[PDB]
Each structure stands twice: as structure tokens, then as C-alpha cells.
Amino acid sequence: NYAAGLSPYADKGKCGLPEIFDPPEELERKVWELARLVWQSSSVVFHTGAGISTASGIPDFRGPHGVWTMEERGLAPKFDTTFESARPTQTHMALVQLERVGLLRFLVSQNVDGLHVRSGFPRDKLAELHGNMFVEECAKCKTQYVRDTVVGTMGLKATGRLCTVAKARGLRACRGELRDTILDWEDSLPDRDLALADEASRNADLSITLGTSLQIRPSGNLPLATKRRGGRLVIVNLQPTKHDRHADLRIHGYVDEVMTRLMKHLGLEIPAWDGPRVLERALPPLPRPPTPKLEP
Amino acid sequence: TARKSTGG
Ligand SMILES: Nc1ncnc2c1ncn2[C@@H]1O[C@H](COP(=O)(O)OP(=O)(O)OC[C@H]2O[C@H](O)[C@H](O)[C@@H]2O)[C@@H](O)[C@H]1O
Ligand SMILES: Cc1cc(F)c(Br)cc1NS(=O)(=O)c1ccc(NS(=O)(=O)c2cc(Cl)cc(Cl)c2)cc1C(=O)O
Numbered sequence: 001n002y003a004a005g006l007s008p009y010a011d012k013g014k015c016g017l018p019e020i021f022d023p024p025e026e027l028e029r030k031v032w033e034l035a036r037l038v039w040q041s042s043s044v045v046f047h048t049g050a051g052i053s054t055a056s057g058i059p060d061f062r063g064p065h066g067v068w069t070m071e072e073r074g075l076a077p078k079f080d081t082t083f084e085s086a087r088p089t090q091t092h093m094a095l096v097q098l099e100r101v102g103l104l105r106f107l108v109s110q111n112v113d114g115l116h117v118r119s120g121f122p123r124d125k126l127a128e129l130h131g132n133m134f135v136e137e138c139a140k141c142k143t144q145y146v147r148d149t150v151v152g153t154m155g156l157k158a159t160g161r162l163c164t165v166a167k168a169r170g171l172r173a174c175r176g177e178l179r180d181t182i183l184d185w186e187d188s189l190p191d192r193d194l195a196l197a198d199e200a201s202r203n204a205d206l207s208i209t210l211g212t213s214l215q216i217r218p219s220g221n222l223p224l225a226t227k228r229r230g231g232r233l234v235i236v237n238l239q240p241t242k243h244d245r246h247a248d249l250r251i252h253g254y255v256d257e258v259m260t261r262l263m264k265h266l267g268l269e270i271p272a273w274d275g276p277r278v279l280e281r282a283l284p285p286l287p288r289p290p291t292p293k294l295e296p
Numbered sequence: 297t298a299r300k301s302t303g304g
């Protein structure tokens with residue numbers, strides 16, 4: 001799998017732990033608590049990882065049939081679908097809506113699947129901390145390029161294409177080297193994107209992690225800064241995570257299900273997906289919906 | 297310089 005040019009010197013972390021499932025009684029009880037917590041909280045940051053794209057047929061890294069998990073035990077990973085053909089999940093779409101109605105301040109993602117951007121989620125409210133298969137970036141001028149198809153390298157290599165930006169004075173092409181945005185093991189995170197995520201998570205008062213085992217830093221430690229500054233922390237993940245001890249609420253369920261219940265408890269529709277819609281800037285906020293009902 | 301790793 002790192003015949004794709006990447007480092008074989010990586011700490012894959014703890015792979016292949018067994019999946020816990022909350023029984024359906026305790027789940028419903030818990031998701032209700034989350035819904036109250038969302039509505040009740042002013043600034044709410046979400047943290048996504050590979051676990052929210054599993055439903056679309058993209059494997060996780062450290063699950064029972066994760067990429068690293070399978071490599072670590074001598075086996076070919078198993079891809080169901082491609083990155084192009086992969087379709088946003090209920091969670092991807094629920095997240096989109098939660099932004100539209102101001103119930104989500106910021107989104108922090110470790111996923112390189114490109115599907116947050118393709119879900120329609122506004123890029124200016126998203127830090128893609130480990131990169132995006134579809135985004136390439138000019139080395140000279142920093143300008144990014146969201147593509148229809150993958151840029152075709154990883155590890156911050158050059159993709160063999162040049163920057164088409166014509167500059168303010170002169171207006172002749174920049175012609176810098178375009179490179180992928182996919183971080184390799186121990187590559188530095190993106191300055192802008194980490195800064196915004198860091199700020200978002202400090203000043204957030206609810207952090208909700210969805211489908212990450214929280215083993216890779218600094219990404220996986222941002223949800224903790226929320227707590228150190230007096231906030232709450234919800235951890236939605238099937239497996240246990242590295243920071244389970246610090247969670248105000250752990251939920252061990254499918255993330256599509258949790259969000260599906262959450263959006264009902266908040267009385268909100270989960271959009272369908274028309275197809276890939278790159279949205280650079282968030283639209284004007286919709287008005288905040290009716291107050292949630294209490295538990296029946 | 298904030299590197300993607302596991303820290304150990
Ligand atoms: N439907 C689901 N609902 C809830 N959890 C799920 C589901 N499907 C899988 N999971 C859980 O989701 C969790 C996924 O954990 P990991 O596989 O470590 O992914 P990461 O994003 O945290 O890894 C971070 C970086 O590491 C890599 O090197 C890349 O650079 C990554 O960006 C598991 O515990 C699953 O049980
Ligand atoms: C549709 C397409 C056009 C291209 F030009 C290129 Br490159 C790839 C694709 N397919 S893709 O979906 O976007 C796609 C993108 C990235 C990877 N990388 S990977 O999973 O780490 C991987 C790396 C290596 Cl060296 C071997 C294997 Cl078998 C898998 C795989 C696929 C794929 O699933 O085949």
C-alpha cells in the first residue's frame with residue numbers, strides 16, 4: 001500500500017481492537033443526551049476520522065478490517081469502492097445541515113477521502129488536517145485546486161502540473177509546481193488549517209469526535225483542548241479510543257445511526273446528495289430550528 | 297512544525 005511512495009517507518013499505532021456495541025436501550029438514552037448537549041451549547045466543533053466514511057465502502061485504518069490492521073497481519077487491504085465513486089454518508093450530510101443552521105461552528109477532519117468537500121460542506125469552515133486526495137497546491141504561491149478526480153500522488157510529491165494563476169501586476173502565469181496535499185508519516189500539518197482547528201477547539205464548548213480512534217496527533221488531541229478550557233467532550237466511535245477516559249459521553253454505535261437519531265431529536269432533515277458540489281464559502285446562516293423535545 | 301505522528 002506504500003508502494004505509493006510513502007514512508008515504511010510509520011508507527012501504525014494500536015490496530016484491530018474489538019468493536020464494542022452499546023445495547024439499543026442505552027444508545028437511545030445516550031443520543032438524546034447528545035442532542036440536548038448540542039442544542040444547549042453555543043459553539044460546537046466536530047472531529048471526523050476514517051470511521052465516518054466506512055459506510056460508503058472506504059475502509060478505516062485501525063478497525064477489524066482496517067488498512068494498517070490488515071497490513072500488520074500480512075494481508076491485502078480490501079477496497080470496495082474508489083474515491084471517485086464513493087458517495088457521502090448520512091453523517092457527511094447531517095454535518096452539512098448542522099452547519100447550515102448554526103449548530104456546528106467548525107469541522108476538523110483527518111480524512112483524505114475528499115468527501116466532506118464533495119458533500120457540499122463549506123471549505124472555509126473545514127480544516128482538512130491530513131490533506132485531500134482531490135486537492136493539489138502550488139508550491140510557489142500556495143494556491144489550491146479542488147479537482148473532480150484524484151491528483152494522483154501522495155506524500156507531498158509533485159503531480160506534474162503547473163499553476164495557472166495570473167498575478168496582479170503583469171498578469172502572466174505563475175507556473176509553480178503543483179503538489180498533492182496528502183501528509184506522509186511525520187510531515188508537518190498545514191499552518192492555516194491547524195491554526196483554525198486549534199482556535200475552533202479551544203473556544204469550542206462542545207467537541208464531538210466521530211469515527212476516529214484518536215491515536216494520531218495533533219489531530220486527535222484537539223478535542224481535549226475543549227475540556228481543558230471548561231468544555232464537554234462526546235466520543236462517538238465503535239472501538240475504544242485513546243481519550244475514552246476524558247469523554248463526558250462515550251457512544252459505541254454506528255455513526256450513521258447516531259447522527260440519524262440525533263437529527264430527529266433536533267427535528268432536522270438530512271439532505272440527499274445531488275453529486276459533487278465544491279462550496280468555497282459558507283452561505284448565510286438559516287434560522288435556528290424549534291427547541292428539541294425532552295425524553296418520551 | 298506540528299508533525300503528524302503518534303508520539304512515542
Ligand atoms: N460506522 C462506524 N461508526 C462508528 N465508528 C466506526 C464506524 N466504522 C468504523 N468505526 C471506527 O472508527 C475508528 C477509525 O479509527 P482509525 O482507523 O484509527 O482512523 P483515524 O481517522 O482515527 O486515523 C487517523 C489517521 O491515521 C491514519 O494514518 C490516517 O492518516 C488517518 O487520518 C475505528 O476505531 C473504528 O472502530
Ligand atoms: C480512478 C483512479 C484514477 C487514477 F488515476 C488513480 Br492513480 C487511481 C484511481 N482509483 S482511486 O480509487 O482513486 C484510488 C486512489 C488511491 C489509492 N491508493 S491506496 O488505496 O493506498 C493503494 C496504493 C497502492 Cl501503491 C496500491 C493499492 Cl492496491 C492501493 C487507491 C485507489 C484505488 O482504490 O484503486
Ligand SMILES: CCCCCCCCCCCCCCCC=S
Binds near residue numbers: 061300
Ligand atoms: C480517510 C480514509 C482513507 C482510508 C482508505 C485508505 C486510503 C489510503 C490512504 C493512505 C494515505 C497515506 C496515509 C499516511 C498518513 C500518515 S500516517
Ligand SMILES: [Zn+2]
Binds near residue numbers: 175
Ligand atoms: Zn502558483
